[PDB]
Design a protein around this ligand. Structure first.
Ligand SMILES: NC(=O)c1ccc[n+]([C@@H]2O[C@H](COP(=O)([O-])OP(=O)(O)OC[C@H]3O[C@@H](n4cnc5c(N)ncnc54)[C@H](OP(=O)(O)O)[C@@H]3O)[C@@H](O)[C@H]2O)c1
Ligand SMILES: NC(=O)c1ccc[n+]([C@@H]2O[C@H](COP(=O)([O-])OP(=O)(O)OC[C@H]3O[C@@H](n4cnc5c(N)ncnc54)[C@H](OP(=O)(O)O)[C@@H]3O)[C@@H](O)[C@H]2O)c1
Ligand SMILES: NC(=O)c1ccc[n+]([C@@H]2O[C@H](COP(=O)([O-])OP(=O)(O)OC[C@H]3O[C@@H](n4cnc5c(N)ncnc54)[C@H](OP(=O)(O)O)[C@@H]3O)[C@@H](O)[C@H]2O)c1
Ligand SMILES: NC(=O)c1ccc[n+]([C@@H]2O[C@H](COP(=O)([O-])OP(=O)(O)OC[C@H]3O[C@@H](n4cnc5c(N)ncnc54)[C@H](OP(=O)(O)O)[C@@H]3O)[C@@H](O)[C@H]2O)c1
Lengths: 105, 326, 326, 105, 326, 326
């Protein structure tokens, strides 16, 4: 499949995106509204360098990084937009060091 | 609803019923019944006429090309299709190679006496020929003028997506349609797979054999009537499907649908044709008839469709029970 | 200024006036007046001749192709256009599909008895056919030799930009021209929209009906003269636009422009034709006449254009008052 | 629309550039001299990594970053060249920390 | 194993033996032996027939086109090839330029009286013409309809990879086959080089001269028999290769392989043909015969191939000893 | 050195001398001298023959097409060129638009009675037509079969680089040659500009008028001889260039080069032709003659070229003194 993040071409296999069949890119009915049948690709008008770490999340199999240039209020929206889930949202948490507050007894 | 609808997302406007061609034309029925069958179908607004090059070993086209030559219809008012696959005993005369598409369409454009067909169909998928050769060959016959569009038939939903990813890469033309079997007992492919391709890439659906070669026609409850389809040679595979316990269970399921036919002032073929047309993901239904009194009652099944409410649909689903998992 | 100018940014050199074709050719006027009308227009430097396939139900082309066959003019010295859209009663005979462009240009190349037209026009936009099919079909008839260029007509400024973004993607040919209505009472599109496309992508403008079918001709103040355009059948829509209060207000606005015509030694049609040619964003004006004495006074309106100073323009704007918001 | 910043293809929608209808890229008469009718794109011969933060200004809806590699005397020219306005110029000010001098009484 | 196999990865289905053409057709043998040689080869399932335009100075094609015209075989059941290279004394009549491919195939499509050949071959590589001109010229004759595929002959494995990197860049058609010499004494190219191209890009191999012009036929041990190939004029280069000490050492190596022929109930040509077909990287073997009793024993070498076990292969390698370094 | 060399980097093999066509063919000389002039030039190895459609108002081609029809030469052994530019009085009959290239080559392929020319030349650059239209039009006549290559003439070195950057973008065909004037008094363009294009993109050079229409022929020292080129009508511009002081200064510079001609056993035209061929960046020289005794001494100037040492070149440079700044 070919994904076109506002001009930057990312091109990966289909079985890589099918590892997580609940996200935006994994569900063939949620990503179907971003198709482009003239160029045979998916076109997202999002931030460019933030998708280099979203695609590596699918390729590595679950790890979440953060690129150095993109700030935290930007990269916390791309995880919210691509619908990676709270499992992936909390894996982004302790990678930045900020542990969530424990539930009071 | 609409009579003349688009074939998928292309520009071709087809009638929602289309007279097909099989054992009837050039085989079972005579030649004078055939010219009678076309003139009382063309006058009722149907313009889509199908054939292929395996039907009657290349004699269904000579009886179709002779009618349009004699009746004097304008070529611009018709839509003639043609399928390419088995049309020879040799080894290099059956396939989807570049040598057979270019030669098979050229030889089937002298039996039809035309200069171009409207859609040229790939009759079944070929596993030996790569997909780049079949898309390049179908684009060559379009650009030479021998056709106008092309489509697939009996291809899976992956090989239609594979013959689109090639065409959008090498700057060729993608297919516009797909012929998939559809009736009340084979409703898997046209209901869960092809409506996803219509939204993604824009292919249509041109369903064939809506009465399952006369099984849903209700004539096969007490046995085999004489001069029927199953009573001809070469159709033992049909007769063994209705004499078996599986077909008689369908005949047991046709008794209740007989009661729903008379409730709406129609017969059971007029329900089964208009049952297929209840969607928008189906662009045309290819009919088939053996005589005039069979056909004029089948074209009348357009008016049954506004009577097809959601209640009659929801309980026909209860009688059949083969609703696919969505 | 210049007589022979380029059609937009293409290589076609057209005369700034061009004899059109409507109800006159093959309909209203006879056939001997038609051959008289072309020979005294071709001799005055006009080479651009228009037709279509809906005019006179396909009889305006047979009376145009017979003149060029008889008079013996060289095909290389003329520019013949043709529009494609409504040319049949059937459903598959009107549209901008691939089946109608290829067939409609081929059938309208036997009524003209030519081998190719120079520009083939899309007469109005089609909403059913996708834009990729119409650009691929117009590039197919150019490459087969049946045309030389193509252009749009009555398309908006977005669908001309959409039929250019496709052609620059699939390596096809973009359009070169656009036919938009332009006179003193419809000056919106050719003044605020099409001069932006001429600088961006390089299409031209070939305006049609500059006298608003004889409304600006000044013959419609006291009523309907006999043997006029409004006195023919099928033109009640024209007559109800001049009998209404809106048209008589335009007739009230034509009384003052009558005074500006005689000041410059011309009549009111000779002003209205040369008023359209005052720009550089308009490449040609398609005329129309019913007899010889109408036409030779219209071709004489070239010399009125160097008399058209900025003062006469600025106060004609005051009389009309329909200057678009720039 | 397609924008070609000296070889790097940025491709965004038209309604994104129409959010700010006073800039260079928002005004269809100021950007019209940078068109390229052979490739159907706008060609600017400017600095490459500085446009990644100009396009994000339109996409996010007003935020101005600065990429780490480009210095301040370079990025202060691209805001001056793309004509983002003093509203966007002063939003670049306190993002770098340097508050402007207050007017004397 | 399989009789009809694909030509590489294309869609063309060829018989594993194919009757070639050299000095025999139009030269050495007569015309009545030639029609006899084709009818008893076409009836045994062989459809692949080769020629070129340098054979008999353009007379091997007139004797091949006259047979198919007279015998009345369908063109769709045959596969006819043709090579382009030397076919004129002038300077602009030999090469792989655009002027010679288009003219040489057009003139060799009147000696064959056909309308298209199936594969058109480049007979040897041209160093003067750039690779972009030869790929653009071979794609032009395919799109005009004069051929169906194209392939190289005697090209190295680098110039086939260079004529593929061009075709995948300018959106042209790559070659599908390659003609490389292959017998027991020239087995370098088809064993270590061409099986790598079949996995990488998908070209085939169509080997020529499997008996080394009769050297492996065993008739050249005691000298030159009369009416042989070496006993004709213009073949001193052949006779000096078997009279030399190098050829007699091969004749010394043919004495032991004579013993392995009679062990398996065959003769030595029936071993040498079926020795070439033991691979899957070879798609067809181009035969050659002078009379009927030569040919029918050569087509019989299909059944020798299932007798070709790994033991007989491994010790034939011991007798020859020219196994290439893998 | 080499007689038959490549035209630039293409595959066309041309003789280094080529018989041209101007005022001689169809004009000045008769028709029996013309057939005599071609048969004694074709027999000396020259195959390149030039014409255009402005020469003799379209009569230089009818006298050239009649010779090849009568003499019975094979079309595959010749190279015929043709230039397109001024061939009509109308406005739409001169230019490099798509309408004139397609029509002008089609009308000039009936005066030549051929089916295709080898190279079709653009005779001078057109500033009105954009470069994308002229490259798309020349690729259309190549793909239709009406030509084989194309080239420019009198274009600057920037517009050849502009008609190459377009062709490598839209996947079209770039030009292969360029016709630039070259003799001892106009040596600017072919010495400092075109050798850079031969290394960069690979165009050739086909120089025209090597004797400057007979100025270097040495017949113009004592005045105007009768029946010369300057003694014909329409050539006052030539006569005013040799009667002026600038031309007589060249005649003063021809007296010393007369002494260098007799030293090498040749005459002054045999030096001036072989002076042009001293490079490798020039692929052919287009000659011109009025009778047989003029031509056979000009073809003999091949053997003068191995006598052209570096010493005779270095002092011819001293006599002329117009060596361009490199
Ligand atoms: N793309 C492919 O691979 C493919 C393959 C096969 C066919 N097709 C297409 O499918 C099209 C449809 O063919 P089909 O015959 O199978 O369709 P069908 O409608 O299922 O078969 C109708 C058959 O039943 C009979 N019949 C029709 N209406 C009847 C009625 N009211 N009462 C009693 N009998 C009635 C007719 O005569 P009888 O009573 O004598 O039976 C007719 O032969 C063909 O024309 C062909 O173009 C395509
Ligand atoms: N692309 C499209 O969709 C489209 C659609 C329609 C038309 N067109 C083109 O538009 C072209 C122009 O047609 P048109 O007739 O509407 O143009 P027009 O110039 O506005 O109409 C002129 C009419 O008025 C009359 N007339 C002209 N000069 C006159 C004068 N001095 N005094 C009195 N009467 C005069 C003529 O005869 P009468 O007095 O009898 O009226 C003529 O019929 C047509 O030829 C057609 O090619 C294009
Ligand atoms: N692409 C290229 O550059 C190229 C070049 C040359 C040829 N080729 C192709 O190669 C093909 C094969 O030609 P080829 O003749 O060299 O193949 P070959 O099989 O090596 O030569 C067979 C020759 O030996 C003789 N022969 C065959 N079987 C025999 C048997 N059992 N006993 C005794 N003699 C037998 C035949 O008659 P004789 O006994 O009289 O010899 C025949 O002439 C040609 O047809 C041509 O199409 C291609
Ligand atoms: N691409 C373009 O724009 C263009 C334009 C013009 C021409 N051309 C080409 O240029 C080609 C060359 O034409 P050209 O005539 O100008 O070449 P040229 O060689 O400079 O002119 C030779 C003229 O001088 C005379 N001549 C030749 N050899 C002579 C000799 N030993 N002694 C005395 N007189 C001799 C001949 O007869 P006379 O004594 O009677 O003069 C001939 O007319 C033409 O054929 C045309 O194809 C191209």
């Amino acid at each position: 499949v070919v994904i076109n993040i506002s001009g930057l071409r990312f091109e990966t296999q289909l079985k890589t995106l099918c590892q997580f069949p609940e996200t935006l890119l994994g569900d063939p009915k949620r990503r179907m509204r971003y198709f482009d049948p003239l160029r045979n690709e998916y076109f997202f008008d999002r931030n460019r360098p933030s998708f280099d770490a979203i695609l590596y999340y699918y390729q590595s199999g679950g790890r979440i990084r953060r690129p150095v240039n993109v700030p935290i209020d930007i990269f916390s929206e791309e995880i919210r937009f691509y619908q990676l889930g709270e499992e992936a949202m909390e894996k982004f948490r302790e990678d930045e060091g900020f542990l969530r507050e424990e539930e009071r007894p | 609803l609409q009579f003349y609808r688009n074939l998928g997302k292309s520009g071709l406007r087809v009638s929602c019923l289309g007279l097909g061609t099989w054992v009837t034309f050039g085989g079972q029925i005579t030649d004078e019944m055939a010219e009678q069958l076309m003139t009382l179908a063309y006058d009722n607004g149907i313009n889509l006429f199908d054939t292929a090059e395996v039907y009657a070993a290349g004699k269904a086209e000579v009886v179709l090309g002779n009618i349009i030559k004699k009746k004097g219809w304008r070529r611009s008012s018709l839509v003639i299709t043609t399928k390419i696959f088995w049309g020879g005993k040799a080894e290099t005369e059956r396939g989807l190679s570049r040598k057979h598409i270019i030669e098979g369409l050229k030889a089937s454009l002298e039996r039809l006496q035309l200069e171009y067909v409207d859609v040229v169909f790939a009759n079944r998928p070929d596993p030996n020929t790569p997909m780049e050769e079949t898309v390049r060959a179908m684009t060559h016959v379009i650009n030479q003028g021998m056709a106008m569009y092309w489509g697939t038939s009996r291809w899976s939903s992956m090989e239609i997506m594979e013959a689109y990813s090639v065409a959008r890469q090498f700057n060729l033309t993608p297919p516009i349609c797909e012929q998939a079997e559809y009736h009340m007992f084979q409703r898997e492919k046209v209901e869960v797979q092809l409506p996803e391709l219509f939204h993604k890439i824009g292919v249509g659906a041109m369903t064939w054999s809506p009465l399952a070669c006369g099984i849903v026609s209700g004539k096969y409850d007490s046995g085999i009537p004489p001069y029927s389809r199953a009573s001809l040679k070469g159709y033992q595979w049909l007769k063994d499907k209705i004499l078996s316990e599986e077909g008689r269970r369908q005949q047991a399921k046709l008794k209740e649908l007989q009661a729903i036919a008379e409730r709406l002032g129609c017969t059971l073929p007029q329900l089964a044709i208009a049952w297929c047309l209840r969607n928008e993901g189906v662009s045309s239904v290819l009919l088939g008839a053996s005589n005039a009194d069979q056909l004029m009652e089948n074209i009348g099944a357009i008016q049954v469709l506004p009577k097809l409410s959601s209640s009659i649909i929801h309980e026909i689903d209860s009688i059949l029970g083969n609703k696919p998992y969505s």
